[PDB]
Amino acid sequence: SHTDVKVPDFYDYRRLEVLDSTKSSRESSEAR
Amino acid sequence: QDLEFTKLPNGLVIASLENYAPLSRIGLFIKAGSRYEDSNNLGTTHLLRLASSLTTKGASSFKITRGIEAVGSKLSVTATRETMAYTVECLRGDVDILMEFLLNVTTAPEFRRWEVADLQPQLKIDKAVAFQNPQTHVIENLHAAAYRNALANPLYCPDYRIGKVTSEELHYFVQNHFTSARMALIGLGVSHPVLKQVAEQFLNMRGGFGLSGVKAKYRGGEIREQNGDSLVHAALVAESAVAGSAEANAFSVLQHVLGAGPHIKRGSNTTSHLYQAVAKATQQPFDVSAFNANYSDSGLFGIYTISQATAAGDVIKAAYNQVKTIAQGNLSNTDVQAAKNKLKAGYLMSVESSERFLEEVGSQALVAGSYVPPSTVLQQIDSVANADVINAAKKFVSGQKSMVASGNLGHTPFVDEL
């Protein structure tokens, strides 16, 4: 059925502004 | 703190119980339903239960809808073949205006041509969602097969009648069946004086009794519906006993000896005679159980099966034979005691919640002069013997059968060859 679902990894494209994780999520959002 | 039955000069019954609950519930119960229709006005009651927010002499449709929403409350309608019920739920202090709404919905409806004619196409939709679960249409056919006239009439509107139920029919039905001597008002979360203030508004409504109807006559029918489905559903019954009878208690205990339904999640139902019988006749998925209905002037008892299409004949037979062994008196004290345990416990669990408790009280109020507490019910259960159970099984085995089946019937048997 569906349960085998998994999004493939997007590591190459994501911003470093969330990978450098020492700041709450929503504040990051605001910076971006 | 206890219930208090009472009857007004109109013949209206009223009862109440001040449980200190934050949510008050009030039910108006009526002797009406599909059994009082005839072939010339079928489907009237279905549209009647859907029409429970059209305009009235006392309040506009817009007013009823928005006013009930604005406090968070609900107004439900529930029917059977024999009774209808209008129920209101509200927070403490909301009663009065909602009671005005209840009064106008039941005693002074308008059935304006255009609103009725805009409401018609919803019958189709409601019946469709009902008929997604296959059990419903099988049971509907079972009543048609089992009876010639009254309990035969369908709960959902016939297809040929959709779009052709008229305002005049609604008016006539309400005028001839919504009468004060057919009624009870029940209140949970409400002090008797307050419920008296409510019932006071009903003093000038339609009095006396109405049209009494006809007695149901038994048919030894058979209905077959052919589809392409790989699973076939079947029901096989006979006539058993009237509601509120000792013999009906016998039949109940028999149902619970044979097997009434599961108790463990993903279990094997080792206690269930029918399930264990069938499990040795088929190796693909099946379901089986026993069936009870009871009415005012009749009742039905039988078996209900679901199986693969090629296995049906083996399943239906394997089930039936099991009952026969009880008729011959292969029955054990241990089974009987376990069955009575299941029955007493299931009964007490069925009335934990106020919603079902209200229903049960309202059902009693329409047919008896005094409320029967559960202890008395438990004793009546305790009082069934083994001989009563065996006699009930013999009644089933001997009497004339009715049958319904739906699916791919290339291997289903005919009622004459069981």
Binding site: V7 | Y20, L91, I264, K265, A338, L348
Partner: protein, 423 residues
């Protein structure tokens, strides 16, 4: 005569106690001949790694299949001879086993309940039978479309984090999980200070506590080697998953933003907002799904394929309306709807027992209806405006769609709908 709020004072208290191993016992006594009793456990799919994703569901399949003291169907026969019922469930975050019974049977009930959680007989034959059953149950399309879209939503929103993974897990895993994995799972997660024993109905608290010491007091409490698995911290991603199949009758759609979690106060106000929102299409709902540190806040609907765009427009417009223009009159209605829901849910012993257990796991304490009423009374249109703006306005959503979804708007078009140019 009383007021609603005054009737909320008559509801009885919930008593709570501790054993020496740190298991907590909680009860609410309601003077009835019937009762519900269960064990709630602070374990779920978000503690499993990709190596054993799906273990708890497996364990749930063979929980009631036998213990050492009661081999095979003996347990089932003893439950059925009392006239009692036995049930279980498993979630992204919790697990539960409970029993419904007569109040007379409490000593046996607890006994059985302790026999089940400490002494299941994980026999190879039964393991293989459950393996075949679960594989068969996964082979055919035995899932409802609603479940499909909600699983897709969790997968896209919480990708790269344990919450993305499903309770059942992949089929590749059930054909490959072993008894060693099951016993390791139990040894590592089923520890006393993570468990609650809850009861509602005609149950006395001290009797329950005595029985708890007798039948549950030997459950260990020493977490060993910190054997508990290390796992990834929480993150929410604005993203979409689209599964197109133009043969299905109707399109299913789900869209959320990130909610605050169990602990925050804001939840109350949000619920009010929900009640205000909830024609075009057949079916529609709003929802809040809470976790420990995060959540999903959004809506779900079904449409004919030619009416997806309009419906999305209507929904996002209502969101913007609440963020910018709410008024007192509607807010009052929403508060009343919320009051009615809260009091309607807690009817009968089962829901109450369940509430006790879930509450002691999530909140650390039972929150009485009076406190909820006091929290509801403080909301007003200004609070709704503020908090809706705080979680909805100009945010990136997570979207999932299944069906004939050609007309589902592009992601940029959906993102631009989360803000107004005239504000």
């Amino acid at each position: 005569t009383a007021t609603f709020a005054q009737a909320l004072q008559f509801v009885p208290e919930t008593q709570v106690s501790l054993l020496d191993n740190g298991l907590r016992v909680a009860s609410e006594q309601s003077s009835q001949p019937t009762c519900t009793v269960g064990v709630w456990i602070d374990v779920g799919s978000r503690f499993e790694t990709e190596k054993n994703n799906g273990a708890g569901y497996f364990l749930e399949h063979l929980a009631f299949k036998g213990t050492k003291n009661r081999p095979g169907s003996a347990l089932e026969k003893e439950v059925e001879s009392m006239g009692a019922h036995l049930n279980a469930y498993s979630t992204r975050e919790h697990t539960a086993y409970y029993i419904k019974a007569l109040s007379k049977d409490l000593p046996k009930v607890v006994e059985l309940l302790g026999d089940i959680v400490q002494n299941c007989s994980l026999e190879d034959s039964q393991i293989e039978k459950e393996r075949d059953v679960i594989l068969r149950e996964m082979q055919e399309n035995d899932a409802s479309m609603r479940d499909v879209v909600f699983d897709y939503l969790h997968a896209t929103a919480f990708q790269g984090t344990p919450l993305a993974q499903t309770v059942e897990g992949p089929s590749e895993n059930v054909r490959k999980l072993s008894r060693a994995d099951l016993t390791e799972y139990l040894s590592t997660h089923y520890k006393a200070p993570r468990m609650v024993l809850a009861a509602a109905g005609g149950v006395e608290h001290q009797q329950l506590l005595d029985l708890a010491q007798k039948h549950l007091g030997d459950i260990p409490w020493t977490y060993a080697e910190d054997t508990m698995p290390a796992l990834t911290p929480c993150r929410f991603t604005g993203s979409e998953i689209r599964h197109r199949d133009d043969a299905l009758p109707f399109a299913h759609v789900a869209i959320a933003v990130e909610g605050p979690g169990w602990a925050s106060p804001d939840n109350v106000a949000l619920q009010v907002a929900n009640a205000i929102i909830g024609k075009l299409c057949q079916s529609f709902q709003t929802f809040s799904i809470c976790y420990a540190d995060t959540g999903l806040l959004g809506a779900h609907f079904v449409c004919d394929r030619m009416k997806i765009d309009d419906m999305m427009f209507v929904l996002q417009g209502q969101w913007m309306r609440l963020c910018t223009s709410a008024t007192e009159s509607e807010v009052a209605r929403g508060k009343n709807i919320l009051r009615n829901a809260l009091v309607s849910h807690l009817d009968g012993t089962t829901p109450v027992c369940e509430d006790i257990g879930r509450s002691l796991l999530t909140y650390g304490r039972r929150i009485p209806l009076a406190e909820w009423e006091s929290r509801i009374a403080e909301v007003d249109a200004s609070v709704v405006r503020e908090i809706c703006s705080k979680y909805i306005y100009d945010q990136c959503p997570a979207v999932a769609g299944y069906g004939p979804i050609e007309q589902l708007p592009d992601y940029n078009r959906i993102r631009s709908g989360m803000f107004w140019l005239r504000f």
